[PDB]
Amino acid sequence: MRLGWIDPLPQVDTIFPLGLEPNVESIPAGEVELDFNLPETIAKPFADTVTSVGDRIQLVDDDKENIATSIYGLSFFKAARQLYSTMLDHEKAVNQPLKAVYYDETPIPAHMSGALGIIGHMKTKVGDVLVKDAGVLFKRGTAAGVTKFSEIDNDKTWNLDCSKLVWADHSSLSMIKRLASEKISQLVKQRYRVTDAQGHVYSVSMPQLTDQALPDYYDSIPDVAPNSDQLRVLTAALQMSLAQFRNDELPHDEDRSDLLTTLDLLYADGAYEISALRDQFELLMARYTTDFKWRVESIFKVGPPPAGTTGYGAQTVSSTGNTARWQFPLSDADINIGYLFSPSKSFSLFPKMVGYSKRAREDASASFANSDAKKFYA
Amino acid sequence: MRLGWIDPLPQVDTIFPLGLEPNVESIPAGEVELDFNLPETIAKPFADTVTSVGDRIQLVDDDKENIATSIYGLSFFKAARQLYSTMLDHEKAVNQPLKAVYYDETPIPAHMSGALGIIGHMKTKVGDVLVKDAGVLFKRGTAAGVTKFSEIDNDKTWNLDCSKLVWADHSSLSMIKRLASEKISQLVKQRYRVTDAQGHVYSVSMPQLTDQALPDYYDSIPDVAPNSDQLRVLTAALQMSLAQFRNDELPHDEDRSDLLTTLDLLYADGAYEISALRDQFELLMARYTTDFKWRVESIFKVGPPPAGTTGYGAQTVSSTGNTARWQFPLSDADINIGYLFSPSKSFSLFPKMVGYSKRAREDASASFANSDAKKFYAD
Amino acid sequence: MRLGWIDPLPQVDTIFPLGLEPNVESIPAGEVELDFNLPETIAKPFADTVTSVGDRIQLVDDDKENIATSIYGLSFFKAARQLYSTMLDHEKAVNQPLKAVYYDETPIPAHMSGALGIIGHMKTKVGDVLVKDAGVLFKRGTAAGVTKFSEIDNDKTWNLDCSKLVWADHSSLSMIKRLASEKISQLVKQRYRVTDAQGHVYSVSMPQLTDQALPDYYDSIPDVAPNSDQLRVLTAALQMSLAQFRNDELPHDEDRSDLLTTLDLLYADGAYEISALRDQFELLMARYTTDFKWRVESIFKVGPPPAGTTGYGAQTVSSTGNTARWQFPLSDADINIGYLFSPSKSFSLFPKMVGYSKRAREDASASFANSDAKKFYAD
Amino acid sequence: MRLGWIDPLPQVDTIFPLGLEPNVESIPAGEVELDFNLPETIAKPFADTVTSVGDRIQLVDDDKENIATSIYGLSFFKAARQLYSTMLDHEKAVNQPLKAVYYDETPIPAHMSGALGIIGHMKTKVGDVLVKDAGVLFKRGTAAGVTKFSEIDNDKTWNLDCSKLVWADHSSLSMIKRLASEKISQLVKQRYRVTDAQGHVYSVSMPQLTDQALPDYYDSIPDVAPNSDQLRVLTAALQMSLAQFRNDELPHDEDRSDLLTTLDLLYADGAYEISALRDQFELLMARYTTDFKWRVESIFKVGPPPAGTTGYGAQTVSSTGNTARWQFPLSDADINIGYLFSPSKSFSLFPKMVGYSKRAREDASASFANSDAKKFYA
């Protein structure tokens, strides 16, 4: 049955079979932007007990700290697994290389596993609600685990803020492009005075990038306008081709260095390059098995990592102090797990349905109405 | 009981004793803007059909028109009744003067009634979704019926475009100011190239009403800027009080005739002034009862005018060609009726819930984690 | 089910369909500060009574003392167990290192147990009322038992005033900073007359830490001001991070030895350092089991150590002379026990509820008024 | 029975009959500060319908407006009645003169009457919770009604902000004195630099009025200190005698004019003088009976004015937008009426109980303990 959100019209009769069946037009019908730190927020409680209980057992110093570190790292690695598991067909295709992350079934504290299960795209009564930028996130979540594990050995090869990383694939590109538009319509709100011979000092702002073509918009940018340089870069970025972005040959000869530094991003290359992560992951996993698995599993009741098909309402909650906040009706456990880990940054539902009709409205109505005509009697 | 919009999470209750109960943080939950002509879109089929059935009692061509004209006006009046019937208690209150429109129960064609029954505020499993500017609409809907009826005799006293009327009350003022803000930001999108002692062509544009003080924003408007006049009026309107709106004393010595002529509205006064509308309504109704009721009821199967407490999903449907579009899941009845009369201009659902826990997150988290605790450190 | 604290209002339900449900807006609902010596106040009667019953098994004078001394220490350890048993999950968590104190079930005199059973956080029909600085208390209570037991042999390793100990954790730091603020505003009440080039005697005083920035407040401290030094240390403490507190790197190059010597606290380190306390506890307990348990249990009727989940009203009672004082209604048991051991230093109940309506006040009001409506204008 | 707020101790036995029965020590055990406008907030809805419905009936212009005005005026007059009805014995004594306000039983819209019923002192399971400054409020509420009614004739004899009025009785005095202390510890928080030969510019504030005697505190006030003059006045006020205040002969020769203007108060005299209000009330009432009673009663279903013995929990609620806020558990109707009229400015509960014992604690405890002694057997 359909969503019983509102009451159904008391079957206003007549109307021949127009054939208006429902069809989703909005693909996706909604998005959720998960908080990059969700996996950290989740591991926290466990990693913590590893520090408190540690001393009573003979787990101390460097060791106590590595065991705790592992939990954060596995938390990221396992959260990646989940997300990938719920990705669209092509999304999995594109991330083919890191599929080893998805396959690994290293156990984790049971409830930590349960919590990670809320992550992922959702099938819902109004359409598909997706995890915005899954591709980027899946890769960031992975880099994060490799990075966290690196702390064990202080190995600074993997030493970057993984939240900022962006690769040279399409998933990252769209994000770059979006974040660009964001900035422009953000900077353009600024004012600057133009003291002219004809009429003293004015007060105007950089024109909003409405219907004007990207090229022209670029030129039409006055060095005097606040953040002139940035507008240039970002506009240029709106023009880039995945290839251009990948080779620092940004249109209007701008620098990727600036584009990225403007959007406070980082270019994943060298160590954080897809391939490199794959290998490093495999090592970290083989290392974890021998060296830390036994402790971790002797401290907690562990269970298999999640690897479901859908995420859950919980991904829609936000927390602060003792209050939770959501938009559409959630179950109780959804609201609870939601309040514990405050998984979302933003959430948008925006369904759109469509129906087709055999006949046009005029005749359809003319008939609807005609039912009230009285029969000429005698 | 909660909207089964998505699949629920299967979980262990260590957490469960928290207290997080859902509370409606913001009111209302949604909003629907109705197409002003909805009453006409519905009346139309019936009005037209009169050319046929009018013969059952041999109506002359002239009379057939008046009967039809009545069905249009009648539609408006009954649609108003419905809307008013669903209004929040404050709105029913302020609109007390025209309550006769709500009280009157003149029968209308049966199906004509059914269709009208879809309009008005609607309570949903997500909260209340209101008809945008219901108060203004209710009066416009009323004025429209008074005008349609004023066609039976070429009486030009009531001869305006009711779809533009605004009165001297808060419901209207509030809408005025909103249309002002929208209009502004629409104009601030234009570009005029001011050539200075500096450089040459400077394709620039007027600042956006971001964080300025209304008074200041007014001053800082470059006489040169495209549609610089409008920006002045409109900015002024955003300031004007209800009081000033009546007396044409728009802050920066601006004319209301401009404010209205800009937003394309008419100042409902004189003839279209509430109390005048009341009397006019009471009369036209009396006339209808003595000159047409019998004819109309001898032609069509009539029924009681809608006057329920909720609107329906149908109000959220839009039609164009042979396609119909909505947003949230609707029943078939709603889709069909909705398709026939394409009743909505816009529709937004923006529910906001909030809950409080009796436990700090740090503690609740602690417990959640202690679930996987082993004997050597569990309680 | 709600606290029948006051008589309910008798009313007509036109209003009732609003949704205003009570939600706990702020946590916790109350707070109780316990007198540190509560364990001693309770042990005392039993310890003393040993001079009598000790004869049942002919204990030499020396042994009688050790037995008594044990009853004091034992009291502390068991009071800690209780408090810990009632702590919020986060506190039980962070205090994991000393959980052996909670685990141990050494029997104590029956009534001695009952009395101790009153301590700890308490859930009430108003919310949770917490034991102020429970975390710090739990460790101090623990250190105290370790110290009392260290008297059996003149072992001076543990010979401090546990009632002043503070550790390098948040629970302590948080308390430190609070005692700092209080101390400041206590000093800022003094008056020193600075004679200027202007006028003569200017009975003045140091500014109150109202809206200044901590750094600035520090600078602006007049070398002349009474207890000007303390104000410096204390202001610094209000800044210092947990990190800095460990390493004696107090912001404005201040000494922790002063901060502590000012607030009259001791830095729990070395001997009184958590892990050291654990080992020490485990040992003294083992010793008690082999050298006194039998004697103690041959003298008194013993029972299991308290370890429930809630404290009781008694914790909110204060005694002086033959008068006993409390605030909110207590049972007799609570008043009596409370009177015997005057367990509280302070007690505050500050519940805060919040509710949301699904109706704007203006509408709800409208309805409320429409109740007295007459026919000519009612729906 | 006692308040079942928390769980009772599991009867820890022994303890001879110490005789510790409970006794309230705090009289009052709590206070509520009602919002001066409560009666206006209440009449609003009714006065409003008098304006909307007015036109359909032949009620218009001056008339429509007077009927509406009446409702506000009666609202104040009836709210005064209620409050007086619940005042302590002496409180009624002191306001003896305005007892006519209490006796008048003019009907009012039924539910408007019901709402006013929440006003007044409360008897509660922890003691007596009083309406702070009832005497002052009762008189203000009365003046307010006389003032509102004056609008009918534009008669500006009664043309003052009644919220500020203070009379020369004790009730008002205590208030003045309290509001003084408030201001001092408020102004004293301010700083001012004292540039000295010995050590450049300092930074100090007016000393808090702690244990110093009022007289000395007065003198010790430097003209340089921010708001020097006010501190003087207010300190002087803390010293006034009801008599001094009544004759403008404030200690340290200060002016009542300033004391009042500092505390943004007004001296009720001349027209707003107790006696004068009494007479005017009587006229307003006789006028209302003839001239407006019939309309008012033909628009609403009316009922007798409230005149109860206690106020109610509702007086404890605060409203804003769609949220209500209270402290201690209230019924549902209490929370509801509370949200509709947001009656309180502040609310404080602060019980204090006392018990006496036949024996001192030492022996009492020595015995409690002695029950665990084992009997020397064979």
Side-chain angles (χ1 to χ4, degrees):
Chain A
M1 202 70 98
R2 302 167 178 175
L3 183 65
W5 129 65
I6 185 185
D7 271 319
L9 187 58
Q11 288 159 45
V12 186
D13 226 313
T14 311
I15 49 180
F16 23 74
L18 302 183
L20 291 156
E21 327 134 83
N23 294 68
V24 179
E25 166 180 49
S26 46
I27 309 299
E31 307 173 308
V32 192
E33 189 177 303
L34 293 172
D35 166 25
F36 171 84
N37 300 283
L38 183 52
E40 180 163 295
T41 298
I42 292 179
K44 165 71 176 175
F46 309 78
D48 274 24
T49 73
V50 172
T51 312
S52 291
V53 183
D55 303 307
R56 303 209 277 91
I57 312 171
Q58 270 37 77
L59 228 172
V60 208
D61 308 317
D62 287 305
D63 296 310
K64 201 211 296 184
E65 201 175 303
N66 299 321
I67 297 308
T69 300
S70 295
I71 301 180
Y72 281 107
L74 286 185
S75 198
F76 281 93
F77 282 156
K78 253 54 266 199
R81 190 200 191 219
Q82 176 62 37
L83 186 63
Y84 183 91
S85 192
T86 73
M87 304 199 315
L88 297 175
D89 279 342
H90 53 279
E91 299 194 308
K92 286 175 183 165
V94 170
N95 297 306
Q96 171 71 54
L98 289 186
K99 210 172 185 186
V101 165
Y102 166 61
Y103 284 52
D104 186 287
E105 302 192 302
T106 307
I108 52 185
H111 286 69
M112 202 197 87
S113 168
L116 292 174
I118 66 164
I119 296 162
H121 294 317
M122 317 146 100
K123 289 292 174 188
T124 78
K125 285 276 185 177
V126 300
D128 289 311
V129 176
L130 304 166
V131 180
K132 209 166 190 184
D133 298 315
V136 173
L137 177 47
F138 165 68
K139 284 186 277 284
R140 287 181 175 165
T142 298
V146 187
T147 303
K148 253 301 190 311
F149 261 95
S150 291
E151 304 187 305
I152 299 288
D153 303 308
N154 274 284
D155 173 302
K156 284 179 181 169
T157 296
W158 318 90
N159 202 358
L160 278 173
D161 178 352
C162 303
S163 69
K164 307 177 182 177
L165 298 172
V166 278
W167 288 264
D169 59 347
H170 284 293
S171 77
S172 301
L173 192 54
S174 320
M175 197 191 147
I176 310 293
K177 294 274 185 61
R178 192 212 319 150
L179 299 173
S181 310
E182 310 288 50
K183 266 292 187 190
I184 317 306
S185 70
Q186 201 48 43
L187 309 171
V188 159
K189 290 180 181 176
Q190 281 165 156
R191 298 176 253 71
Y192 65 96
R193 302 198 173 189
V194 183
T195 317
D196 208 314
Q198 33 110 305
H200 62 291
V201 301
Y202 283 43
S203 196
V204 294
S205 290
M206 234 304 263
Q208 287 159 46
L209 171 51
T210 61
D211 68 332
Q212 45 214 301
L214 289 179
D216 311 314
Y217 188 72
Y218 187 68
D219 307 312
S220 52
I221 303 181
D223 316 33
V224 52
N227 300 292
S228 170
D229 301 317
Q230 297 166 57
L231 289 169
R232 300 175 187 299
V233 187
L234 298 168
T235 313
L238 292 173
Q239 306 179 65
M240 318 177 302
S241 61
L242 181 48
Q244 289 181 291
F245 175 62
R246 179 173 164 284
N247 306 300
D248 190 51
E249 306 171 305
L250 306 170
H252 295 301
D253 206 297
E254 284 295 329
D255 291 314
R256 168 211 288 165
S257 312
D258 311 312
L259 173 55
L260 296 183
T261 191
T262 297
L263 301 184
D264 191 38
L265 296 169
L266 298 179
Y267 189 64
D269 68 322
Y272 290 84
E273 184 276 302
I274 291 283
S275 147
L277 289 177
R278 222 273 180 167
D279 312 303
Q280 190 52 30
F281 172 61
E282 289 160 34
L283 288 202
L284 290 173
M285 285 302 98
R287 204 286 194 59
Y288 169 72
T289 312
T290 302
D291 302 27
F292 314 125
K293 196 188 204 286
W294 75 277
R295 274 289 185 183
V296 175
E297 267 162 44
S298 68
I299 302 303
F300 306 88
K301 291 186 187 172
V302 300
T309 325
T310 300
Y312 288 88
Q315 275 171 148
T316 270
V317 183
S318 298
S319 305
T320 355
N322 79 317
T323 65
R325 213 161 307 208
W326 58 105
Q327 307 180 59
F328 283 74
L330 295 179
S331 72
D332 269 292
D334 270 312
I335 288 180
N336 269 46
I337 289 309
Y339 162 66
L340 281 187
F341 310 100
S342 176
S344 70
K345 300 305 290 180
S346 68
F347 165 44
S348 262
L349 212 65
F350 38 61
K352 248 146 306 170
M353 310 276 97
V354 188
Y356 303 150
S357 170
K358 300 176 187 174
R359 296 299 298 290
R361 307 162 50 193
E362 293 85 312
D363 194 278
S365 301
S367 299
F368 177 73
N370 205 268
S371 300
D372 293 326
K374 287 193 174 183
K375 302 181 183 179
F376 181 87
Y377 276 158
Chain B
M1 193 283 276
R2 301 178 188 168
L3 194 73
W5 138 61
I6 190 185
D7 272 305
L9 185 71
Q11 177 63 47
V12 172
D13 56 307
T14 315
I15 48 180
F16 285 42
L18 282 179
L20 297 167
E21 205 82 58
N23 299 72
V24 176
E25 174 172 63
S26 189
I27 291 175
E31 199 182 52
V32 182
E33 192 182 306
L34 293 170
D35 164 18
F36 173 79
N37 326 291
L38 183 49
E40 183 164 286
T41 300
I42 295 175
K44 162 76 171 179
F46 303 88
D48 288 351
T49 278
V50 170
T51 313
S52 289
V53 266
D55 289 359
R56 195 180 133 98
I57 58 179
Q58 323 262 297
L59 292 193
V60 184
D61 284 329
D62 304 286
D63 286 315
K64 274 183 181 175
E65 281 185 292
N66 299 317
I67 287 298
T69 306
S70 291
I71 294 179
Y72 274 106
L74 231 76
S75 190
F76 278 105
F77 288 153
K78 290 313 158 204
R81 170 208 176 65
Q82 171 71 313
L83 176 60
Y84 179 92
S85 187
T86 72
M87 304 186 127
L88 278 309
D89 269 280
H90 183 61
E91 306 173 307
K92 292 187 178 179
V94 306
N95 284 298
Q96 198 60 50
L98 292 177
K99 198 164 186 172
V101 183
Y102 162 79
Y103 283 140
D104 182 284
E105 317 203 306
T106 308
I108 51 178
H111 293 70
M112 152 110 66
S113 175
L116 292 180
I118 69 165
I119 60 205
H121 298 320
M122 53 192 92
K123 63 150 187 172
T124 68
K125 281 189 171 183
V126 168
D128 301 310
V129 186
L130 311 176
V131 183
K132 213 170 194 180
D133 306 89
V136 175
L137 188 55
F138 171 71
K139 306 187 194 68
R140 300 197 181 185
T142 293
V146 172
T147 302
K148 257 310 192 315
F149 262 90
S150 285
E151 278 175 48
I152 302 299
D153 308 305
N154 262 54
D155 186 285
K156 283 188 177 183
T157 301
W158 319 88
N159 179 40
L160 288 184
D161 185 36
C162 308
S163 70
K164 299 174 181 176
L165 301 184
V166 295
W167 287 262
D169 56 10
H170 290 296
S171 71
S172 294
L173 174 61
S174 182
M175 178 189 76
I176 298 279
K177 288 187 171 178
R178 193 238 310 166
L179 298 182
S181 299
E182 277 175 53
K183 186 58 168 178
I184 301 284
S185 65
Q186 196 50 56
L187 297 174
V188 174
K189 290 187 174 181
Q190 291 171 168
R191 297 171 267 87
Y192 67 102
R193 8 98 180 190
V194 150
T195 301
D196 201 293
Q198 290 189 312
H200 316 66
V201 297
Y202 273 56
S203 301
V204 77
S205 185
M206 233 292 275
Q208 287 168 45
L209 178 50
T210 62
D211 71 312
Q212 302 87 152
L214 275 179
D216 295 314
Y217 191 75
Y218 186 72
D219 296 312
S220 43
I221 301 185
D223 195 299
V224 189
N227 305 302
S228 179
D229 314 284
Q230 298 56 64
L231 293 178
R232 303 174 178 303
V233 198
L234 293 167
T235 303
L238 289 168
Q239 299 188 62
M240 83 175 139
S241 65
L242 171 51
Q244 305 165 55
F245 185 62
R246 294 203 200 72
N247 334 294
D248 185 67
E249 308 181 308
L250 304 183
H252 306 294
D253 205 52
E254 217 79 40
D255 286 327
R256 183 222 291 152
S257 58
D258 293 304
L259 173 52
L260 303 185
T261 194
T262 295
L263 302 171
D264 190 40
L265 311 169
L266 305 188
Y267 185 56
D269 85 310
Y272 291 81
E273 179 218 316
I274 305 301
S275 57
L277 277 152
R278 179 198 315 105
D279 303 333
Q280 196 46 40
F281 171 75
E282 285 283 23
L283 295 170
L284 296 162
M285 273 303 97
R287 154 205 269 295
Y288 172 77
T289 309
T290 65
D291 304 321
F292 310 115
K293 184 187 207 297
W294 187 86
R295 322 222 214 187
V296 171
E297 281 167 54
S298 289
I299 294 174
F300 299 93
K301 309 184 179 186
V302 294
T309 45
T310 309
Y312 291 80
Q315 300 196 73
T316 59
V317 178
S318 256
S319 302
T320 11
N322 295 289
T323 64
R325 305 192 181 190
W326 58 102
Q327 305 180 54
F328 280 79
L330 294 177
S331 79
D332 289 300
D334 289 299
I335 296 177
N336 277 57
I337 292 299
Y339 168 64
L340 290 197
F341 317 95
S342 175
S344 67
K345 282 305 176 183
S346 56
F347 169 48
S348 292
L349 223 52
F350 32 50
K352 282 182 172 40
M353 312 302 301
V354 68
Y356 296 65
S357 169
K358 300 202 192 78
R359 274 291 167 279
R361 296 177 69 208
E362 42 155 28
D363 299 309
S365 294
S367 319
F368 185 75
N370 291 335
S371 294
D372 308 324
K374 284 202 177 182
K375 300 183 182 179
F376 78 96
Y377 74 96
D379 276 318
Chain C
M1 193 283 276
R2 301 179 188 168
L3 194 73
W5 138 61
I6 190 185
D7 272 305
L9 185 71
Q11 177 63 47
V12 172
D13 56 307
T14 315
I15 48 180
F16 285 42
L18 282 179
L20 297 167
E21 205 82 58
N23 299 72
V24 176
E25 174 172 63
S26 189
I27 291 175
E31 199 182 52
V32 182
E33 192 182 306
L34 293 170
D35 164 18
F36 173 79
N37 326 291
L38 183 49
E40 183 164 286
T41 300
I42 295 175
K44 162 76 171 179
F46 303 88
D48 288 351
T49 278
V50 170
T51 313
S52 289
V53 266
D55 289 359
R56 195 180 133 98
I57 58 179
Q58 323 262 297
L59 292 193
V60 184
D61 284 329
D62 304 286
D63 286 315
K64 274 183 181 175
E65 281 185 292
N66 299 317
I67 287 298
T69 306
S70 291
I71 294 179
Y72 274 106
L74 231 76
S75 190
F76 278 105
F77 288 153
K78 290 313 158 204
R81 170 208 176 65
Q82 171 71 313
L83 176 60
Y84 179 92
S85 187
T86 72
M87 304 186 127
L88 278 309
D89 269 280
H90 183 61
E91 306 173 307
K92 292 187 178 179
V94 306
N95 284 298
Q96 198 60 50
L98 292 177
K99 198 164 186 172
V101 183
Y102 162 79
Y103 283 140
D104 182 284
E105 317 203 306
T106 308
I108 51 178
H111 293 70
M112 152 110 66
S113 175
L116 292 180
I118 69 165
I119 60 205
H121 298 320
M122 53 192 92
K123 63 150 187 172
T124 68
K125 281 189 171 183
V126 168
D128 301 310
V129 186
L130 311 176
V131 183
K132 213 170 194 180
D133 306 89
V136 175
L137 188 55
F138 171 71
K139 306 187 194 68
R140 300 197 181 185
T142 293
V146 172
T147 302
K148 257 310 192 315
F149 262 90
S150 285
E151 278 175 48
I152 302 299
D153 308 305
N154 262 54
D155 186 285
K156 283 188 177 183
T157 301
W158 319 88
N159 179 40
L160 288 184
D161 185 36
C162 308
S163 70
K164 299 174 181 176
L165 301 184
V166 295
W167 287 262
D169 56 10
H170 290 296
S171 71
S172 294
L173 174 61
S174 182
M175 178 189 76
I176 298 279
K177 288 187 171 178
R178 193 238 310 166
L179 298 182
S181 299
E182 277 175 53
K183 186 58 168 178
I184 301 284
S185 65
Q186 196 50 56
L187 297 174
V188 174
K189 290 187 174 181
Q190 291 171 168
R191 297 171 267 87
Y192 67 103
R193 8 98 180 190
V194 150
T195 301
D196 201 293
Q198 290 189 312
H200 316 66
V201 297
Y202 273 56
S203 301
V204 77
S205 185
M206 233 292 275
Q208 287 168 45
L209 178 50
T210 62
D211 71 312
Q212 302 87 152
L214 275 179
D216 295 314
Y217 191 75
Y218 186 72
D219 296 312
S220 43
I221 301 185
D223 195 299
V224 189
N227 305 302
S228 179
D229 314 284
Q230 298 56 64
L231 293 178
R232 303 174 178 303
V233 198
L234 293 167
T235 303
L238 289 168
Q239 299 188 62
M240 83 175 139
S241 65
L242 171 51
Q244 305 165 55
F245 185 62
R246 294 203 200 72
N247 334 294
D248 185 67
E249 308 181 308
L250 304 183
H252 306 294
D253 205 52
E254 217 79 40
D255 286 327
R256 183 222 291 152
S257 58
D258 293 304
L259 173 52
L260 303 185
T261 194
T262 295
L263 302 171
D264 190 40
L265 311 169
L266 305 188
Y267 185 56
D269 85 310
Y272 291 81
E273 179 218 316
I274 305 301
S275 57
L277 277 152
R278 179 198 315 105
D279 303 333
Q280 196 46 40
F281 171 75
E282 285 283 23
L283 295 170
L284 296 162
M285 273 303 97
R287 154 205 269 295
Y288 172 77
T289 310
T290 65
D291 304 321
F292 310 115
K293 184 187 207 297
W294 187 86
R295 322 222 214 187
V296 171
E297 281 167 54
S298 289
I299 294 174
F300 299 93
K301 309 184 179 186
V302 294
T309 45
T310 309
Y312 291 80
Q315 300 196 73
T316 59
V317 178
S318 256
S319 302
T320 11
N322 295 289
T323 64
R325 305 192 181 190
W326 58 102
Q327 305 180 54
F328 280 79
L330 294 177
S331 79
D332 289 300
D334 289 299
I335 296 177
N336 277 57
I337 292 299
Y339 168 64
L340 290 197
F341 317 95
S342 175
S344 67
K345 282 305 176 183
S346 56
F347 169 48
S348 292
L349 223 52
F350 32 50
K352 282 182 172 40
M353 312 302 301
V354 68
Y356 296 65
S357 169
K358 300 202 192 78
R359 274 291 167 279
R361 296 177 69 208
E362 42 155 28
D363 299 309
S365 294
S367 319
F368 185 75
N370 291 335
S371 294
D372 308 324
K374 284 202 177 182
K375 300 183 182 179
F376 78 96
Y377 74 96
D379 276 318
Chain D
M1 202 70 98
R2 302 167 178 175
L3 183 65
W5 129 65
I6 185 185
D7 271 319
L9 187 58
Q11 288 159 45
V12 186
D13 226 313
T14 311
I15 49 180
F16 23 74
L18 302 183
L20 291 156
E21 327 134 83
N23 294 68
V24 179
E25 166 180 49
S26 46
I27 309 299
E31 307 173 308
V32 192
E33 189 177 303
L34 293 172
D35 166 25
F36 171 84
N37 300 283
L38 183 52
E40 180 163 295
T41 298
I42 292 179
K44 165 71 176 175
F46 309 78
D48 274 24
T49 73
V50 172
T51 312
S52 291
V53 183
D55 303 307
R56 303 209 277 91
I57 312 171
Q58 270 37 77
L59 228 172
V60 208
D61 308 317
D62 287 305
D63 296 310
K64 201 211 296 184
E65 201 175 303
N66 299 321
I67 297 308
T69 300
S70 295
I71 301 180
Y72 281 107
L74 286 185
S75 198
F76 281 93
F77 282 156
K78 253 54 266 199
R81 190 200 191 219
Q82 176 62 37
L83 186 63
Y84 183 91
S85 192
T86 73
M87 304 199 315
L88 297 175
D89 279 342
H90 53 279
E91 299 194 308
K92 286 175 183 165
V94 170
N95 297 306
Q96 171 71 54
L98 289 186
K99 210 172 185 186
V101 165
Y102 166 61
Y103 284 52
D104 186 287
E105 302 192 302
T106 307
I108 52 185
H111 286 69
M112 202 197 87
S113 168
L116 292 174
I118 66 164
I119 296 162
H121 294 317
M122 317 146 100
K123 289 292 174 188
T124 78
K125 285 276 185 177
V126 300
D128 289 311
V129 176
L130 304 166
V131 180
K132 209 166 190 184
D133 298 315
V136 173
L137 177 47
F138 165 68
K139 284 186 277 284
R140 287 181 175 165
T142 298
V146 187
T147 303
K148 253 301 190 311
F149 261 95
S150 291
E151 304 187 305
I152 299 288
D153 303 308
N154 274 284
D155 173 302
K156 284 179 181 169
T157 296
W158 318 90
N159 202 358
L160 278 173
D161 178 352
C162 303
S163 69
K164 307 177 182 177
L165 298 172
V166 278
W167 288 264
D169 59 347
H170 284 293
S171 77
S172 301
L173 192 54
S174 320
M175 197 191 147
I176 310 293
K177 294 274 185 61
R178 192 212 319 150
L179 299 173
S181 310
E182 310 288 50
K183 266 292 187 190
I184 317 306
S185 70
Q186 201 48 43
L187 309 171
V188 159
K189 290 180 181 176
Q190 281 165 156
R191 298 176 253 71
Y192 65 96
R193 302 198 173 189
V194 183
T195 317
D196 208 314
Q198 33 110 305
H200 62 291
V201 301
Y202 283 43
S203 196
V204 294
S205 290
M206 234 304 263
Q208 287 159 46
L209 171 51
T210 61
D211 68 332
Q212 45 213 301
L214 289 179
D216 311 314
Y217 188 72
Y218 187 68
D219 307 312
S220 52
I221 303 181
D223 316 33
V224 52
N227 300 292
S228 170
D229 301 317
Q230 297 166 57
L231 289 169
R232 300 175 187 299
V233 187
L234 298 168
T235 313
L238 292 173
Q239 306 179 65
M240 318 177 302
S241 61
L242 181 48
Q244 289 181 291
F245 175 62
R246 179 173 164 284
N247 306 300
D248 190 51
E249 306 171 305
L250 306 170
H252 295 301
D253 206 297
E254 284 295 329
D255 291 314
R256 168 211 288 165
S257 312
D258 311 312
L259 173 55
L260 296 183
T261 191
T262 297
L263 301 184
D264 191 38
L265 296 169
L266 298 179
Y267 189 64
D269 68 322
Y272 290 84
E273 184 276 302
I274 291 283
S275 147
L277 289 177
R278 222 273 180 167
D279 312 303
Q280 190 52 30
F281 172 61
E282 289 160 34
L283 288 202
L284 290 173
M285 285 301 98
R287 204 286 194 59
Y288 169 72
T289 312
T290 302
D291 302 27
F292 314 125
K293 196 188 204 286
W294 75 277
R295 274 289 185 183
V296 175
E297 267 162 44
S298 68
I299 302 303
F300 306 88
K301 292 186 187 172
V302 300
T309 325
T310 300
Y312 288 88
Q315 275 171 148
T316 270
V317 183
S318 298
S319 305
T320 355
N322 79 317
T323 65
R325 213 161 307 208
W326 58 105
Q327 307 180 59
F328 283 74
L330 295 179
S331 72
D332 269 292
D334 270 312
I335 288 180
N336 269 46
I337 289 309
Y339 162 66
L340 281 187
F341 310 100
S342 176
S344 70
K345 300 305 290 180
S346 68
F347 165 44
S348 262
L349 212 65
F350 38 61
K352 248 146 306 170
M353 310 276 97
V354 188
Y356 303 150
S357 170
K358 300 176 187 174
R359 296 299 298 290
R361 307 162 50 193
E362 293 85 312
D363 194 278
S365 301
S367 299
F368 177 73
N370 205 268
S371 300
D372 293 326
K374 287 193 174 183
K375 302 181 183 179
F376 181 87
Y377 276 158

